[PDB]
Amino acid sequence: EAVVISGRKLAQQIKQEVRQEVEEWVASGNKRPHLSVILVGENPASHSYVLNKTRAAAVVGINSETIMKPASISEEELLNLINKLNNDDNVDGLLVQLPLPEHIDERRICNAVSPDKDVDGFHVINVGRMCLDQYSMLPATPWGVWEIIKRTGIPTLGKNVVVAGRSKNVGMPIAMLLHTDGAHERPGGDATVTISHRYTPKEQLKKHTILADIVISAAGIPNLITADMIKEGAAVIDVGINRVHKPKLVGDVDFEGVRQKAGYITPVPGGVGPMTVAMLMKNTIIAAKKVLR
Amino acid sequence: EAVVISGRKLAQQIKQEVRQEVEEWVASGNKRPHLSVILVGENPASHSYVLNKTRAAAVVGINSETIMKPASISEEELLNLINKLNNDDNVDGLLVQLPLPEHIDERRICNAVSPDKDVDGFHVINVGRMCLDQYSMLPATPWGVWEIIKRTGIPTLGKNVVVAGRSKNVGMPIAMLLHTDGAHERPGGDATVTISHRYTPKEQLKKHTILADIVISAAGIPNLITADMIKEGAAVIDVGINRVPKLVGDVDFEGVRQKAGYITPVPGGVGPMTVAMLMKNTIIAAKKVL
Ligand SMILES: NC(=O)c1ccc[n+]([C@@H]2O[C@H](COP(=O)([O-])OP(=O)(O)OC[C@H]3O[C@@H](n4cnc5c(N)ncnc54)[C@H](O)[C@@H]3O)[C@@H](O)[C@H]2O)c1
Numbered sequence: 001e002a003v004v005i006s007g008r009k010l011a012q013q014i015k016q017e018v019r020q021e022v023e024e025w026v027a028s029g030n031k032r033p034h035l036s037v038i039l040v041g042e043n044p045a046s047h048s049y050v051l052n053k054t055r056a057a058a059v060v061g062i063n064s065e066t067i068m069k070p071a072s073i074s075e076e077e078l079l080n081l082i083n084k085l086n087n088d089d090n091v092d093g094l095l096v097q098l099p100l101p102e103h104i105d106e107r108r109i110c111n112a113v114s115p116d117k118d119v120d121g122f123h124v125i126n127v128g129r130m131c132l133d134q135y136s137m138l139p140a141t142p143w144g145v146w147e148i149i150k151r152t153g154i155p156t157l158g159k160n161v162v163v164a165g166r167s168k169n170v171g172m173p174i175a176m177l178l179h180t181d182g183a184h185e186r187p188g189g190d191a192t193v194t195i196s197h198r199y200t201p202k203e204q205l206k207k208h209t210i211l212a213d214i215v216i217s218a219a220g221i222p223n224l225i226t227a228d229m230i231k232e233g234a235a236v237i238d239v240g241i242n243r244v245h246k247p248k249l250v251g252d253v254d255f256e257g258v259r260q261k262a263g264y265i266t267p268v269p270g271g272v273g274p275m276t277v278a279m280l281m282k283n284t285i286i287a288a289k290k291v292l293r
Numbered sequence: 294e295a296v297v298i299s300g301r302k303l304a305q306q307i308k309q310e311v312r313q314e315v316e317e318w319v320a321s322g323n324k325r326p327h328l329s330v331i332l333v334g335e336n337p338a339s340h341s342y343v344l345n346k347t348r349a350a351a352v353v354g355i356n357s358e359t360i361m362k363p364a365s366i367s368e369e370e371l372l373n374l375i376n377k378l379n380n381d382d383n384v385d386g387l388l389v390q391l392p393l394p395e396h397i398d399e400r401r402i403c404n405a406v407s408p409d410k411d412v413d414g415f416h417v418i419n420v421g422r423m424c425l426d427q428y429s430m431l432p433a434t435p436w437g438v439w440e441i442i443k444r445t446g447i448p449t450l451g452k453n454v455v456v457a458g459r460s461k462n463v464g465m466p467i468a469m470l471l472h473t474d475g476a477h478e479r480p481g482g483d484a485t486v487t488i489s490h491r492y493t494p495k496e497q498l499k500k501h502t503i504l505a506d507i508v509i510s511a512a513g514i515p516n517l518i519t520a521d522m523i524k525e526g527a528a529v530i531d532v533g534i535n536r537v538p539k540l541v542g543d544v545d546f547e548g549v550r551q552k553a554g555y556i557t558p559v560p561g562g563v564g565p566m567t568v569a570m571l572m573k574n575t576i577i578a579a580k581k582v583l
Pocket residue numbers: 141164165166167169170171196197198199200205218219220221224238239240241242272273274276
């Protein structure tokens with residue numbers, strides 16, 4: 001039966017690294033790092049996430065402020081805020097919680113944030129750089145996924161990976177990190193990767209996962225992954241966060257089933273979720289160092 | 294048995310489309326599209342490709358000028374050339390033949406060409422936009438590969454694709470187009486895509502290909518793909534170009550030819566498509582659509 005992986009524990013380790021690196025930076029006599037969050041409207045979940053991020057900044061000694069705005073705000077105004085922040089030398093990282101209200105174009109907002117402060121890594125230049133295997137502000141969730149794999153010692157070079165989901169913010173970047181060259185400016189995983197999505201037939205998913213040393217699910221579909229899909233010994237990383245109904249939270253994996261076949265697995269809750277917030281703290285210290293100028 | 298797809302004829306079809314689109318465009322009173330090509334040094338294969346480019350441009354009614362330069366050119370010079378051309382409102386499309394010589398940072402160069410004139414689609418912004426399924430100047434070989442698939446009518450949505458190779462110019466862009474959402478601003482093929490590369494073991498490659506309705510091969514290895522890798526009735530697209538003289542694909546042509554439903558030859562396959570799609574991109578650039 002399968003080693004469960006604590007993303008809670010892993011994430012706290014990473015936050016320890018960041019805490020130290022920030023104490024170092026500051027005692028060297030540099031300004032304390034400052035993360036600015038913009039939060040629009042009242043998605044409950046959005047609120048929760050921003051709070052996750054600001055707690056985390058607190059515990060690692062990063063200054064934060066959430067600038068909160070009414071859902072009624074206009075795209076043009078939001079660009080104005082973002083522009084103030086890009087220009088404020090005190091602001092190191094800057095991020096816009098998502099999703100934004102439908103009268104606001106995300107892509108244009110994401111491209112508004114200065115790439116050097118873009119701790120979500122969603123700016124088109126950061127996407128370009130990442131897709132060219134260049135140093136970039138990597139997106140927190142895919143980076144977290146990669147850190148779970150790397151820190152658990154699960155090998156990837158030569159191995160087969162299947163990612164369910166192909167979103168630009170999660171699925172695609174995971175697939176990008178894992179298939180790319182270990183030798184490149186930003187090393188990849190040298191895996192053989194299969195991208196599946198909402199039009200992969202279930203028989204086809206299974207036909208691929210079955211061959212996989214690593215399965216990574218980011219579809220938002222409970223029990224999308226079940227033990228008959230999963231090779232014996234495989235690592236299974238659960239990126240999904242689904243609300244089932246009192247109301248709880250679950251992954252795209254059949255946790256109970258899958259841990260019978262799998263060599264490793266990540267719980268939801270307590271897996272990838274907290275890793276996301278951890279890798280965001282890493283990006284903030286990186287941004288404060290203007291290391292990737 | 295296996296339909297051979299003529300890259301020559303499809304490229305010819307696309308050329309005719311561009312030719313007509315240029316006529317209308319000039320007839321509307323617009324400037325004639327102009328393509329500038331920079332050649333550095335004397336790589337024979339380079340010289341050859343640049344000629345195929347300017348020749349294509351001439352048949353479709355697009356003006357070309359190749360600016361050939363000594364291998365010894367400084368990087369600061371080339372960037373100065375590029376900045377001039379970027380600034381010349383009569384140049385619609387600019388492209389730098391590859392490879393450059395060792396003292397030249399290719400990435401600094403690709404990123405120096407105006408994104409709006411980047412007919413090769415190699416600027417980081419065009420790569421980014423492509424990877425977000427936005428409108429972009431698509432790279433010519435990948436777009437060529439896609440066109441061979443659409444125009445031949447081979448289905449992709451739901452279907453299983455394997456790509457051999459992961460280079461930023463060919464393999465990766467191909468994989469991007471084929472797996473992404475048909476509904477996005479730049480539609481993709483909604484297929485299930487496996488990316489393989491130099492650390493995929495033959496074993497693993499084969500277990501993936503046998504499941505593939507489309508195998509696309511862009512690895513630069515003679516006979517990488519043999520009929521036992523393929524599945525009866527499957528589309529096999531050979532992007533490879535191997536100097537063994539003679540020129541051969543990644544695929545074993547006569548071999549695969551019997552099992553494949555479709556196949557593309559080398560020569561006369563993807564290569565001509567690349568030149569066609571670049572004409573498509575030059576007219577787009579000229580129109581300043583994006
Ligand atoms: N753990 C984290 O920190 C974190 C961060 C972001 C998102 N998520 C979770 O990951 C999931 C996906 O989020 P997102 O924004 O990346 O995705 P999304 O909602 O934008 O899209 C989900 C993707 O899954 C694909 N998909 C749908 N059905 C599928 C199927 N049957 N098989 C394979 N692929 C299928 C779709 O094609 C799409 O690309 C959600 O549960 C989300 O909450 C988790």
